[PDB]
Write a structure and sequence with these properties.
The complex is a heterodimer. Helices cover 4% and strands 37% of the residues of chain A. Chain A contains two helices and 17 strands. In chain A, the strands form six sheets. Chain A has a four-stranded antiparallel beta sheet with strand order 11-12-15-14. In chain A, strands 2-10-8 form a three-stranded mixed beta sheet, with no helix packed on it. In chain A, a hairpin with a 7-residue loop joins strand 4 and strand 5 (50-51). The longest helix of chain A has 5 residues, at 127-131. Chain A is elongated and about 75 Å long. Chain B is mainly β. Chain B is elongated, with a radius of gyration of 23 Å. The chains are: A mainly beta, B mainly beta. Chains A and B meet through strand 5, strand 11, strand 12, strand 14 and strand 15 of A and strand 5, strand 12 and strand 15 of B.
Chain lengths: 219, 214
C-alpha cells in the first residue's frame, strides 16, 4: 500500500483557466529500474476512465497539448492550461512501483458559480403510505450552490435521528447548481408517536441555519 | 486499435458466483498484464489483481486472494475473473485492463449486483404539503417511490400545468430494494387550478402508475 492524497477534492473552475490538481504518494515511486510511476487518468461520467499522461511526464496518444505532468518526491502535478468542456470529470492519479497499485481519491472539475442559498421544503407523510404501516418524511433542499451541505433531523429537537437516505444530484446543466432529497424513515407508529419534526440544513450562505418544521398534531 | 470488451452486467443471488470475461482485439495476448479494477460507488478504485496470458502467471491483492480467480484462453483471447461466494459488498462495476508502465486501455464495464430480491413494483407515495405550512411563490411537490427492483424506474412527471424545475433524485440501494423520489417546481396560481400527476413506470414488470397529488 501507499497513500495518494489528491491535495484538492473539488475544482470549481469557470472555462478557460489553468488547472493545478496535486497528488502526493506515500513513498518513493522510483523503482529500482530507474523510472518513477505516477500516472494520470480522467473519468468521464458513465465511462471506464482513461490514461492521461503516463510515466509522470510522458504524454499519451490522441491526447491534448493542454496537459502538463511533472514532479519529484512526494509531490506530483497535473496542469491543464486551457480547460475546455470535454475535460470535465474526475482525475485519478496512480502508483505502480509497489504492489499493490493504489489509486488516488479523485479530484473533480466542476463549473464555477457564486454561492446560492438552498431552498428547503418539507412535505409530511401520505395517508396511503400511512396505510401500509410505513411513514416517511422528506425534506427537499433544491437547486443551490456550493455542494457541501449537511442536514440534521432533530425530530422534535432533542434526538438526532439517523435512519436517513440521502440522494444527491450530478451538477445542473443550465444552472450549475445542485439539488437534494433526505428521507428520514419511520416505523408508522414511531411517526404517530411525535408532534412536529424539523429538518435542519447548514450551508454557508446563511448565518442562521435554514430550518423547516412539520406538525404531526394540529393537522 | 486494440479493444477489450466485457460481458454484460448481471444480477446474482448470494453464494452464487459470476464469470466476467474480457475479450481483447488488436495485438498479441501473451505480453500484457490483464488488470481488473473495482469501482464501487463511494470507495473509488481498488486494483484487484494482475495476470499475464500465455505464461499463466498471476498476481493478487492479498485482500482478493481466495475470492478471485484469473484464467485466460490464449486461443480465444478472453480474460477471466471468477468471484466465488458472492455478497452485498461485491455489488459494483468491474473493469478489465491492458496496462504496463501505465494502464493502457480499459474495458467497458460489467456491473455485478448482489441482491436477494425478486422482481417487484414501486409502491408510489405522493409527497404533497399537508396542513398549512408552505406559502407563496412555487408550490413544490413530489412523488416518492419506496422499494422495488431492479433499476428499471422512469418517471413521467410532465408538469401539472405552469412549471419546469424537475428533479429526479438518484436511487439508493438499501436492503436490496430501491427507493428514490421525483420533485417539482409549480407556482401557486397554477395549482390546484389544474392537476399535476406523476406516472411511475417500471418496465421490468410492465406495470405502471398514475397518481394525481392533491
Amino acid at each position: 500500500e501507499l497513500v495518494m492524497t489528491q491535495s484538492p477534492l473539488s475544482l470549481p473552475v469557470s472555462l478557460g483557466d489553468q488547472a493545478s490538481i496535486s497528488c502526493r504518494p506515500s513513498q518513493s515511486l522510483v523503482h529500482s529500474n530507474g523510472n518513477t510511476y505516477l500516472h494520470w487518468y480522467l473519468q468521464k461520467p458513465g465511462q471506464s476512465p482513461k490514461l492521461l499522461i503516463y510515466r509522470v511526464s510522458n504524454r499519451f496518444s490522441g491526447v491534448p497539448d493542454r496537459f502538463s505532468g511533472s514532479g519529484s518526491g512526494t509531490a506530483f502535478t497535473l496542469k491543464i492550461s486551457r480547460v475546455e468542456a470535454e475535460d470535465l470529470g474526475v482525475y485519478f492519479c496512480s502508483q505502480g512501483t509497489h504492489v499493490p497499485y493504489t489509486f488516488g481519491g479523485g479530484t473533480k472539475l466542476e463549473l464555477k458559480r457564486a454561492d446560492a442559498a438552498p431552498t428547503v421544503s418539507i412535505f409530511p407523510p401520505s395517508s396511503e403510505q400511512l396505510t401500509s404501516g410505513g411513514a416517511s418524511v422528506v425534506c427537499f433542499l433544491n437547486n443551490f450552490y456550493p455542494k457541501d451541505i449537511n442536514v440534521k433531523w432533530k425530530i422534535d429537537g432533542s434526538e438526532r435521528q439517523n435512519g436517513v437516505l440521502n440522494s444527491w444530484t450530478d451538477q445542473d446543466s443550465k444552472d450549475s447548481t445542485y439539488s437534494m432529497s433526505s428521507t428520514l424513515t419511520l416505523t408508522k407508529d414511531e411517526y404517530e408517536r411525535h408532534n412536529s419534526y424539523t429538518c435542519e440544513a447548514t450551508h454557508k450562505t446563511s448565518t442562521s441555519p435554514i430550518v423547516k418544521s412539520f406538525n404531526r398534531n394540529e393537522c | 486499435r486494440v479493444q477489450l470488451l466485457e460481458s454484460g452486467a448481471e444480477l446474482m443471488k448470494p453464494g452464487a458466483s459470476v464469470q466476467i470475461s474480457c475479450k481483447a482485439t488488436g495485438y498479441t495476448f501473451s505480453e500484457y498484464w490483464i488488470e481488473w479494477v473495482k469501482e464501487r460507488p463511494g470507495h473509488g478504485l481498488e486494483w484487484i489483481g494482475e495476470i499475464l496470458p500465455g505464461s499463466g502467471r498471476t498476481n493478487y491483492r492479498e485482500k482478493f486472494k481466495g475470492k478471485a480467480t484469473f484464467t485466460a484462453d490464449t486461443s480465444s483471447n478472453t480474460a477471466y475473473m471468477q468471484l466465488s461466494s458472492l455478497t452485498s459488498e461485491d455489488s459494483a462495476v468491474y473493469y478489465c485492463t491492458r496496462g504496463y508502465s501505465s494502464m493502457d486501455y480499459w474495458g467497458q464495464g460489467t456491473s455485478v449486483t448482489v441482491s436477494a430480491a425478486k422482481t417487484t413494483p414501486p409502491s408510489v407515495y405522493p409527497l404533497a404539503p399537508g396542513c398549512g405550512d408552505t406559502t407563496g411563490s412555487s408550490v413544490t411537490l413530489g412523488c416518492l417511490v419506496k422499494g422495488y427492483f431492479p433499476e428499471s424506474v422512469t418517471v413521467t412527471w410532465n408538469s401539472g400545468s405552469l412549471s419546469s424545475s424537475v428533479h429526479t433524485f438518484p436511487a439508493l440501494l438499501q436492503s436490496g430494494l430501491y427507493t428514490m423520489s421525483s420533485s417539482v417546481t409549480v407556482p401557486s396560481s397554477t395549482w390546484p387550478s389544474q392537476t399535476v400527476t406523476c406516472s411511475v413506470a417500471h418496465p421490468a414488470s410492465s406495470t405502471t402508475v398514475d397518481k394525481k397529488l392533491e
